[PDB]
Structures are given as structure tokens and as C-alpha cells.
Amino acid sequence: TVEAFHKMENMKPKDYKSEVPTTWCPGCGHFGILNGVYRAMAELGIDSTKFAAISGIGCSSRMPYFVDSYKMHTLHGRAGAVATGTQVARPDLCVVVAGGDGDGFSIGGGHMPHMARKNVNMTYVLMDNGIYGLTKGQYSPTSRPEMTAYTTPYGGPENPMNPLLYMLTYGATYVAQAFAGKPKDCAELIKGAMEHEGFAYVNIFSQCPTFNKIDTVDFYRDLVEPIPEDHDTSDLGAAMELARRPGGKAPTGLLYKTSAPTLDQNLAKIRERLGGHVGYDKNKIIALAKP
């Protein structure tokens, strides 16, 4: 049970801004996601002393610097695996990972299935700009094949992957998508992801104007399509149909939400069935080794 929520009264988004100046390019989509993060934290009345933001490497991954909380800046692709250890060690914390499409699904792609499958109680905000921004413009697993980039000057020789479909297939128990140009949409879906008990994933399109010249704001605005209100967010099959983009349109809103035991809850059940506690008489364990 996360103890960071509803501990502060009359909070405003600016109360969660750190003193660190934001160094992203002008027009970078990551600004809209940062604004959504601020709004979510204020709407939850969060005491950020109980909030742990963990990121790897990338332009996206610099976002915790701009948020007033505890944070760890770790290695490229490892934020989610690190966050699993933080979360399991301290289930009272609100644990959030932020990172980009390369950090998450290239080098970090092997850790993604197990976080979701084990239903770790954390939030993963993936800022999808269809490129590697921080390393100055190589293509990513979400890049379109017609894009040319610095290691693919002749186009991408493969198709992109589907992050929402991956996460649904992996078993994420809260799956949503938004566009950074709608920061209030980001805030609502990020807020719901934090309160959700289980692995909550929010894929947010974010423009990189400096290096990605085809996945522009106008492209993302035209690409998205809000999810109809009659969609059943407990229907996994319907969520996967949405993730596959009917008519070629990317869904925005909440695709899927279900209640299932979390990893820390299952680990606690193990300790409970043993009567485990910190004061346990370790002589009982030692005695098992007597000849």
C-alpha cells in the first residue's frame, strides 16, 4: 500500500518542480509529459518524500532531475529492473520509471516482460519519440521504416514494434496511451497509473523536432484517436485490437485495467505462510544443520 498519496493539501503542479533548469530543446515533446507528471502528483496530494523516480539514459531519462522527489539516475536500460528492487524492498514508496523508446525497448527490452508479468506495483511512463534523441539521432524500435537516420542513411531495414501490444501481451494490468501535446490527458492517465495497484504502463508520443523530422506534432495529432467511452477496459482482446490501431489510428485513453495480485503482495504471502518476521529466532535455522 503506497503511503505517498493524499498526504499534502492544496498542492499545485509547481510544488513538484525542482530547482534544476529544464535543458530539453524548445518544442521537445518531453515538456508536455513533465507537465502531466506535475499535475498528476499535485492532484494526488503526493508527499514526494515517499516518491522514488528511477531512470536510465536518454533525453527522456533526464525528467526526474526536474521533479522534486527521491531519484536515482542509473544505467541505460536498467531503470525498470532497478526499480523492481526498490519497490520490493519498500512497497510503501510510490515508484515511477521514466524513459524513452530506446532505453525501454532496445537495451531495456529484456526486463520489460518480467516487470509486467510479475505485476510489480510501479508506473512506467515511456516517452516515445521514434528515435534516439540523446545520442543525436539513430533510429529506434518504434521508428518508421521510411525514416532515414544516422546509422540508417538508406532507411530502416525492418518494421517497428507495438509498445502497447507488447505490454498487453506481457500482462501489464494498466495500459494507456497519450500524446504530449495534451498534457491534461497525460496527467489523468499518469495519475491513474500511479494509483493503480500493479504494473501500470503509459506510452506517450513525444515529438523530437531536432532529429525526428517525420514524427512531428502534426503527424502525432493526426495519428491519435481517442478511445470511445463504450470500450470495455476489462476486455483484454478488445484492448489488443485497439493497440493494433484500427484504421491505422493510435488509440489514446485507458486501454486496459485489471486487478490482480502484485509481486510484493505475493512475496508477502510467502512470508506470511512462514510466520516470518524480523525478530525470528535464527537459532531455529541453525539448528537444522545439527548432525
Binding site: 518524500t49 522534486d68 528492487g85 524492498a89 537459532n283 544443520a289 545439527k290
Partner: protein, 572 residues
């Protein structure tokens, strides 16, 4: 005067070779004897030749010994695998008549004792009780206490019913009777029982897991790998009892990542692995050093390089443990000698990670992992526990505050007024990225001076032997220490001018203590099981000693006679 007896039992795994040895070991411990065991499982899981060797003595044991005094073959393959060691003077028990082989010419001087183990078990309509027959014969022939042996069998089979137990005791008695009918011509007898000591029997990997728990372990993450998985098995069973959690990660990178995340959250955390896993962990161990986050990795070394020889003996991960990080990225490196160390030095490892906020690697090996020993029963209150330095809450918190002892107070998330960043980028006192020349020089000195100050606090480099000048000094590490200990007993009994030193802190190294030892020796020999002489390399690089490397690299440990012979070659 011979105080020990070495009994090797070998045959088809699945006929109870391993359980038979464990029964003998437990019985000898209940009779007040010291015990040192080793075993090899079948090469393939489906089965095949397995081996168990139990050494029992009225005095302390430090290794497996040179070779067996008594050999018991359950089948012909076991006889062939050990034929060259069945030498005149040894006792040889074998499955006859009714076994699966005709024994070759048993050399004259070998005391042979045929016992129909297989057929006797068949007459009882229970071939799986074959090992019970062998135990009876061995007990009778070589004075393994029948009283404590039946206690051990009763503890195992009493839970199955008085019929099952009385059945296995009859098979035992049948084997005892068969051996009594033979005339004992060999001089080998297990020492007579003594007052039973307050001991336990533990394998190396279980002892590492227990040492972790006794050191205050709260979070364990691992990925299975031979020969380290039994650590996770033991922790998984017992750590939840103490309020901690074990998680099996998807690989070694995930495991060390979770260890760092749990440690950042304020929990004492560790993993266990072997060479391949430690190599995968190199990048994240750099993060531990740079971010000053406590973590402990136990590397149960196996045969390398690459996939290597997973089941064999080798201590060849010292290069990787010390130099495996990119940049200037030091680790604190320890290495254990015996089962006692597997407990206390895993506590040491957790303590040093707490005190110095640094990655600690403890090097074990695949023989120690499965060897068992009688050790004095551990009492939790006998272990000193160290906790990470925490912020006193005064002033403004700076995660990487520059202090006189170079150790910055830590603060777990949730601590009021201690929001901060832990980071792998080079950084200033507040953890903000900082690429200036002066700061990099300053922070290198902070982290290096911090970790190097282990030398002022943790001393674990015992010296034994002659007090004055020695003709030969021996320096070794790992479980090879135990082999050299027995060699020193033999050499010092002959009045030879020899001394020995047993580094268990491997990095950083106590150079002055190395130099003082070397100044009192005409020669220094360094036996170790790796191809390059890895400890000798660091002795050459960091000390004034010019060592003579004695390297072997064939998947086997040294024996005491190997050490004795090499030392005598260097005196005369």
C-alpha cells in the same frame, strides 16, 4: 601417528552414493569427530559415476587429504575410475559376488574385502537398500560407530514407519555380518568416539546463505548458475522466515540491478553467481562504485574461461573481480577458505559493503560449495553487525558530502528532508552531474581513499610457521589455504624453516604486511589454481616480493603432498 581416515565411496549415482557419505559424516560428527567431505555428482543428470569422499579425525581437518585410505566400489565403473589410486597399503571394499564386474588383478599389498552389496539387497527384494548393506560392512570393517550410524538412519527413516526403518536396519546388519566374517588385515580404523562437540555440519553454499542471513540480509536476487544455485535455494527457504525476500530475476544483470535498487531503498542486499554471471555484472558494479551504493556479490568460482568446466575446481576469477570494471572502478574483494569462512566472511562482506558503501565481491569455489565440514555451532549474537552511516538530520542533506573519512551519510527514501539523487554520472556533493577536472580528481580520491581505508579496519591475513628467517614462505588464497595448512603441519614437524601467509582480503591489498612477510623469507612460493598465477601477478604489481608461481589448472585442487614436495624442491 595417523589421526584421520579417508574413505572414498563411488559408483552409480542414484544407488545412494551421496546419501551414504552424508550418513557417515553425520555419524562421525555425533561421535565427537571432525569431518571434511567432498563429492562429485554424476557428469550427466540422468546418472552415472558419482563419488563421495569423507575424512574423519580426532583432530581438526582443513582439506580433503592426499588420497583415500579406504575405497568402496559399488560397481565396476567405480573400480576403473579409481584403479590407479588403489595402491598397496590401501583397503578396497567391492561388490562381490553378484556385482556387475570381474575385478582385475588386485595388486599385492591391497587389503581387499568383497561384500555382496547388490545381491544381498536383491534377496531382500529391495535393490535400493544396497547402500545400507555397504554402510554395515564399512562400519564393521573400519570402526564407524554403529550406535551413531543407526541414530542417523533412525532420524531419516523413522518418519516413514517402524517397518521401513527396521527393514533398513536389517540390511545394515546383514552388511555388518558379511564384513565380520572376513579377517581384517588392514591397519585402518576411524578414531574412537569422543565427547560430541557443539557443532553443525554444513556445505559451503548453504553456509554462504546462512552467513548472509546472520549478517542482516533483507533482499536477495539471483539467477541460477552452477555451482552457485544452492545459495539461492538456502536463502529462498530461510530468508522469508526473518522478514526478508528472495526474488529470482530473469538474468544476472537484472539481479544485480535489483540488488542496487533494494540497497538504494535502504535494505542490505546481495546476490550469488559464478564467473559468467560476474562478467555480465561488470557494468552495474561500476554503478555501485560510482554511486557509492552498498552491494555484495558472491562468486562461486568454476572452471573457465567462457562456459569452461562448470563442475570442476578453479580459482581464476581474481582478475575479473579486481579489474572487471571500465574506467578506474575498484571493488573490495575477499576470498573464503572453508565452511566457517563461508558464514563469517559473508557477514564480513555485508558489513564492509555497509561501512564503505561500495561493491564487495566474495570469491568462493565449486569444491567448497559442495564440501561439508563440522564447524562449531554458530550463535547469532557472536557476529558483529555494521550498518551504513545514516544522516543525523541536521542542516542540508548532501548525498555525496565530503567528510574527513570520505564516507557520506546515506538516507533511505522516505527520510524527511533527505530527497537526493544517487547517480552513475560523475557528480558533485549533491549528486548533480559535474564534469569539471577538479571535481573528477577530487571524487576519485574520495571513493578510492574510502575503499582503500578497508586496509586500516579489516585485517585477515594470518601468518604461521617459524618466527625467524625462513628458507621458504608460502602465500596462497581461497580453499588452497586449507591444503597449505596441512602441508605446513608436515613441514614444521620435520623442523624445516618454512612459514605461510593466508590473505583473505584480496583487494585492496595490505602491501606493508606483504613486504614485512617477504623480508623474512629467502624465497616465496605462491600456489594457486589458475593458469596465469593471478595472485602472483598482483604481488608483483603491488609489493616488493618476487614470487615463484606454482600454478596448476586442471580442474582439481592441490593436495598437501603437492605443496610439501614443491617446498622441499626449493630448499635443497
Amino acid at each position: 601417528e595417523k589421526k584421520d581416515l579417508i574413505i572414498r565411496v563411488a559408483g552409480e549415482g542414484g544407488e545412494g552414493i551421496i546419501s551414504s557419505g552424508d550418513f557417515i559424516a553425520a555419524a562421525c560428527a555425533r561421535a565427537g569427530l571432525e569431518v571434511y567431505t567432498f563429492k562429485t555428482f554424476p557428469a550427466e543428470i540422468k546418472g552415472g559415476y558419482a563419488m563421495y569422499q569423507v575424512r574423519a579425525s580426532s583432530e581438526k581437518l582443513y582439506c580433503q587429504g592426499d588420497t583415500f585410505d579406504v575405497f568402496c566400489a559399488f560397481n565396476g565403473e567405480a573400480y576403473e575410475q579409481n584403479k590407479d589410486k588403489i595402491k598397496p597399503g590401501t583397503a578396497f571394499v567391492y561388490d562381490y559376488p553378484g556385482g556387475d564386474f570381474e575385478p582385475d588383478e588386485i595388486p599385492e599389498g591391497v587389503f581387499a574385502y568383497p561384500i555382496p552389496m547388490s545381491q544381498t539387497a536383491k534377496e531382500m527384494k529391495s535393490y535400493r537398500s544396497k547402500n545400507m548393506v555397504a554402510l554395515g560392512a564399512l562400519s564393521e570393517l573400519f570402526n564407524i560407530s554403529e550406535n551413531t550410524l543407526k541414530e542417523v538412519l533412525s532420524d531419516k527413516f523413522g518418519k516413514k514407519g517402524e517397518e521401513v526403518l527396521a527393514f533398513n536396519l536389517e540390511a545394515f546388519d546383514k552388511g555388518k555380518a558379511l564384513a565380520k566374517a572376513l579377517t581384517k588385515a588392514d591397519p585402518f580404523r576411524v578414531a574412537d568416539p569422543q565427547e560430541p562437540k557443539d557443532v553443525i555440519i554444513m556445505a559451503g553454499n548453504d553456509a554462504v546463505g546462512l552467513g548472509g542471513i546472520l549478517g542482516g540480509l533483507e533482499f536477495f536476487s539471483a539467477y541460477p548458475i552452477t555451482p552457485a544455485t544452492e545459495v539461492a535455494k538456502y536463502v529462498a527457504t530461510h530468508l522469508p522466515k526473518c522478514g526478508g525476500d528472495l526474488v529470482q530475476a530473469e538474468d544476472e544483470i537484472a539481479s544485480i540491478a535489483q540488488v542496487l535498487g533494494a540497497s538504494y531503498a535502504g535494505k542490505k542486499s546481495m546476490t550469488a553467481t559464478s564467473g559468467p554471471g560476474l562478467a555480465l555484472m561488470s557494468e552495474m558494479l561500476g554503478m555501485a562504485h560510482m554511486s557509492e551504493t552498498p552491494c555484495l556479490v558472491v562468486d562461486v568460482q568454476r572452471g573457465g574461461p567462457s562456459t569452461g568446466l562448470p563442475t570442476k575446481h578453479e580459482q581464476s576469477d581474481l582478475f575479473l573481480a579486481i579489474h572487471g570494471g571500465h574506467g578506474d572502478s575498484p571493488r573490495i574483494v575477499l576470498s573464503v577458505e572453508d565452511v566457517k569462512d563461508c558464514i563469517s566472511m559473508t557477514v564480513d562482506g555485508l558489513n564492509l559493503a555497509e561501512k564503505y558503501q561500495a561493491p564487495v565481491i566474495v570469491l568462493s569455489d565449486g569444491s567448497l560449495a559442495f564440501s561439508t565440514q563440522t564447524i562449531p555451532r554458530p550463535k547469532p549474537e557472536d557476529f558483529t553487525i555494521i550498518n551504513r552511516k545514516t544522516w543525523d538530520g541536521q542542516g542540508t542533506y548532501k548525498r555525496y558530502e565530503l567528510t574527513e573519512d570520505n564516507i557520506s551519510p546515506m538516507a533511505a527514501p522516505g527520510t524527511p528532508n533527505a530527497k537526493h539523487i544517487a547517480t552513475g554520472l560523475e557528480h558533485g556533493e549533491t549528486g548533480a552531474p559535474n564534469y569539471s577536472p577538479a571535481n573528477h580528481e577530487l571524487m576519485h580520491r574520495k571513493r578510492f581513499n574510502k575503499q582503500n581505508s578497508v586496509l586500516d579496519f579489516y585485517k585477515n591475513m594470518e601468518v604461521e610457521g617459524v618466527e625467524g628467517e625462513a628458507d621458504v614462505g608460502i602465500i596462497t588464497w581461497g580453499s588452497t589455504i586449507g591444503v597449505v595448512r596441512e602441508a605446513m603441519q608436515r613441514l614444521t614437524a620435520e623442523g624445516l624453516k618454512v612459514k605461510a601467509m593466508y590473505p583473505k582480503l584480496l583487494w585492496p591489498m595490505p602491501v606493508a604486511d606483504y613486504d614485512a612477510f617477504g623480508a623474512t623469507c629467502k624465497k616465496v612460493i605462491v600456489p594457486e589454481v589458475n593458469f596465469q598465477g593471478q595472485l602472483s601477478h598482483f604481488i608483483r604489481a603491488e609489493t616488493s616480493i618476487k614470487p615463484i608461481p606454482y600454478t596448476i589448472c586442471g580442474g582439481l585442487p592441490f593436495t598437501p603432498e603437492m605443496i610439501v614436495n614443491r617446498v622441499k624442491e626449493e630448499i635443497q
